[PDB]
Amino acid sequence: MYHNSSQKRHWTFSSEEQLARLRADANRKFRCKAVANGDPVFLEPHEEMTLCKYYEKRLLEFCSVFKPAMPRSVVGTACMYFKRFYLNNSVMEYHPRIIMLTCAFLACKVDEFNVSSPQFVGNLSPLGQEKALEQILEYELLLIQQLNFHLIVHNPYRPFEGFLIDLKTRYPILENPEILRKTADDFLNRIALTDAYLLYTPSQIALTAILSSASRAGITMESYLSESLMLKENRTCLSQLLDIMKSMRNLVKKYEPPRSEEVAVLKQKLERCHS
Amino acid sequence: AKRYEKLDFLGEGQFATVYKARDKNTNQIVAIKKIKLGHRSEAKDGINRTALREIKLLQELSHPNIIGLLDAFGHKSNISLVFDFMETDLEVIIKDNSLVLTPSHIKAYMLMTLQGLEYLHQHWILHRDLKPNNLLLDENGVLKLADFGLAKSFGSPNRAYTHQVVTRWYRAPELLFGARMYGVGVDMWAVGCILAELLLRVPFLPGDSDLDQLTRIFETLGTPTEEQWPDMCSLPDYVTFKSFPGIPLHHIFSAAGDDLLDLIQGLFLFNPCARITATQALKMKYFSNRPGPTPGCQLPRPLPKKLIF
Amino acid sequence: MENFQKVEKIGEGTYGVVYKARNKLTGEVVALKKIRLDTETEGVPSTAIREISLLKELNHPNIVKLLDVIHTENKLYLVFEFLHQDLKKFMDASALTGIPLPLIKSYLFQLLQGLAFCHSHRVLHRDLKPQNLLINTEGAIKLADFGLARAFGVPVRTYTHEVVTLWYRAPEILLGCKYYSTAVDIWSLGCIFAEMVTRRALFPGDSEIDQLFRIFRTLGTPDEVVWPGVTSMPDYKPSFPKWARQDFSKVVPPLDEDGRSLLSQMLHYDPNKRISAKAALAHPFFQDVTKP
Amino acid sequence: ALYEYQPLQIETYGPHVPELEMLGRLGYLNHVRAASPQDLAGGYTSSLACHRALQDAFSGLFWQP
Amino acid sequence: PDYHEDIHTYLREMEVKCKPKVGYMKKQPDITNSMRAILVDWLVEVGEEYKLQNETLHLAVNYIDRFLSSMSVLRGKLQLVGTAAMLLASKFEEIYPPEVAEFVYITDDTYTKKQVLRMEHLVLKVLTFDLAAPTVNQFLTQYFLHQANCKVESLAMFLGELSLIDADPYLKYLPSVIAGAAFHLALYTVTGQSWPESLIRKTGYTLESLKPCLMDLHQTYLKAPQHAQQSIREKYKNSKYHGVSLLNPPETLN
């Protein structure tokens, strides 16, 4: 369960400033190591963040076309592994393509989505396929180590379903909660692009998506929080809940997708770095 | 890595090699399991799935009666898991005829097993591999469930369940009939079997095949009808058996009291929904009755002719 | 001991670690199985004793060669000729295109010759599965992994713990027969033949009961006519569902008439009526065999 | 010293979840997929899925890092 | 089966290579035939105690004979050799061998477990892992297919086991010849028939060729009640072996 999980204990950070500090530390550490081995080729932390965003989108598009069809939990786990791994490491030390392939491999193994190695590499020239399998096998344990052996990832999909059941049962003011589903799902996807997975609990994310979809439709469910969730007894908790949801919404608002030409330039820079 | 000094050998097997080591930082004795690569056919699977299962499940649990994963280092080829060092298990105590299992000892062992299991099932995890040699013990007489290599989370309607059943001596009848969806009953049945072992020092139902295991179960407890198992015939591997009458429970366990008999009957109910749960088992009058469980410190600790030429 | 240089670690089974290694004095690459005699409270494992003792006598082109045995106070080394991959990996790789029919016929011919040599030397392999059949680059296939092998100069009892995996288990074993015979190897070979032809396991059961029911669904539930004495077997139940045999025109579509007849003889319910290895070698299915 | 049962007291940092035995009483089971007879034979009920979904929905809702 | 003749031919070929050296007893400076007889009798008793098969006992005796044919052993280490041979035979033949602890216990802790393991290693080194030895039991099993009287089978097994006690007259005969002579003796005792023609064409053994071992086995049968070792007869007194030990040997053999 989430309330006593390793994700809550070690992988939920107070603010975006902590995340920026960790990523800057990883970048500076790699720069120091490279200069100790023996200047305009190193990537600034924001460029690394842009490259990580692009490769997360690439991993999403890889998982969407996977055969047999990947469940949503496996994709969420892989994306969380990607974010966690590059929180403490630098792209110029490990290529994000191999890293995201390894993240998907590890997620499939962890989430009990049984596929053999040949099936996994078939979703990618055969020679490149065996090379990719070799690199994935090489990087699996490094990825596990950089995750501190915290492998179970809690996703917002089951909390979303639970919220829908609760709304259908105890909220007759809303006629048919099912119409809230599709739009909310879209919002969830937007949440997955931002940094909110490392800052909020899955239940908070699911509730934010649901209430944002409801507000887009012109329905207000302030009573659902105040009455159904019994929050009128503790007004302070309701206040923090609204502030958390507003912070998530602002985080989605401020998100800027990677630009194609900038991504190409930075891809050339990173390829030179790994060369 | 390089912070452990191997200083013994504890056992080997198909999956892992266990030795006993020193932490060299806190100077505490630990147990290290090296995970073997298996057959050469399984040389391109990466890290073993059983090891990943154990790591991921044990990193999210913390209870006095569940084995603790202290560390999980690994060379890029071989991965090793570090657990607390436990001196024995329940199988050794059961098979050792020098020591006597008083009722208080049995109550203590059952109580710790059930407390660990209740904590486990509260987190939506099934052990699925309960047997006496998986209930470890230490010098202080603290029982801990171990060997989480078959454990899986339940509750989600996804049918990811792919066999991986316990040794057939403790397998629940619904698993012998091939159920794909199940709940806590599969653990509870095994608990009952373990209890029976503690009451007889021998395996309760020692079948040599799945059909023979079902035959032994139905001979000992009676062939279930549709009243006591409403949907039994819908299971994929269902086989019709003779209508065995069954042996009364007080005949099998002659020394057991009435409360113990009620607990055993609850643990061995054929209907998996009516079979008692760990929380319900802990509330039964057996545990709150006199005598109380033995304190952990007081638990017991383990032709011919010469030829002259 | 010092004559071999360990190239890499290939596998790690129940008792020994397998390395790919090189012979320094000759340069040939071998598979070195190391069993540490220390840490054993019983001495040499009985499986290793049986494997070495039986494999010393089995000198055939289609059986893996035990080149040398190095015995030390605390270690025991077995040297095998090295073959790069097994037939299971080959079938996985050659899926979606299919193994050519001449290659399948040649592989079955070689496997039958090896098994006949094993059986004429009163040896029961007991573990015939694709993972234990090793192929080389020259088009040859060899029986390997004689860890479960037994000599049947006297009849061999059946052990629950030591037995082939589910998919290639013979029905007499599934019904609880007391003694092994040579026909279990023939059943496994027939299952592997069908798997090679159709690119999937013939009987991919999940449990013992499921495997038995899959066999019954494909070949028909047996009775005392097709399999005399079946109703007296320990695990036979009168209430088994009575399915009807489906003709081999659909279980193995690509196979021809001779191949279907051979597969049907290999898949006989009655162990006594099941075809033998050499009688299978004399089948008209193998009139035109050539190694590709 | 006799044993006395004490329920597990794990803080969930969220709204209270109704007990499993009551789920069909308050009508939650009206909005989950019905269990097949095969599932009931195995011991799997729709109440399990409903309780799991509710517990995951209400877990850590009031928590702040 | 169609491999049955091939198996018999292979056994006939392999009994030559696994045949112990003849006359090794007088090359042993310490131990003699009487000590060997006591050891084999104790082995029979041990096999009874742990419910081992007769094939295991035959294999153990063969390993002892082969081991003593190239190594010299003090009279205090003979029982250790027997224990290691029995453990090796159990590992090769039994479905699961008894633990080494049971073996060291059955000799009232005369030797340590380490000694037993080291001597087992030494025996394996001496034999070069050649443990699949044809025995009298295997040839008797092969011959029994040409009959079907259970009393005859039990008596032939009893005579084959009796042939193990004495090393002086029987170590010069191959196991096939001993098995054939025992089968003939059992047939004559119970049914009164002779060596069947099918067995003559299968093995190539006539009555004349089996004659020497035949009179040796008959003399052994006659003097069995007075023999100092009796655990074999006590073994075959049970109804499981149809109680053929307390039968009446033929006073003449023609």
Numbering used by the authors:
A (entry chain I): 1 to 38, 44 to 129, 132 to 282
B (entry chain J): 9 to 310, 340 to 346
C (entry chain K): 1 to 292
D (entry chain H): 244 to 308
E (entry chain L): 176 to 322, 325 to 431
Please give me the paper's original passages concerning this structure:
CDKs require cyclin binding for basal activation, but for maximal activity they must also be phosphorylated on a conserved threonine residue (Thr160 in human CDK2) within the activation segment or T-loop of the kinase. In metazoans, this activating phosphorylation is catalysed by the CDK-activating kinase (CAK), itself a CDK-cyclin complex consisting of CDK7, cyclin H, and MAT1 (7–10). The CAK integrates regulation of both CDK activity and transcription, as it also phosphorylates the C-terminal domain (CTD) of the largest subunit of RNA polymerase II (Pol II) as a component of the general transcription factor IIH (TFIIH). Our data reveal that CDK7 and CDK2 interact via a pseudo-symmetrical head-to-head interface composed of two main interaction clusters in the N- and C-terminal lobes of the two kinases.
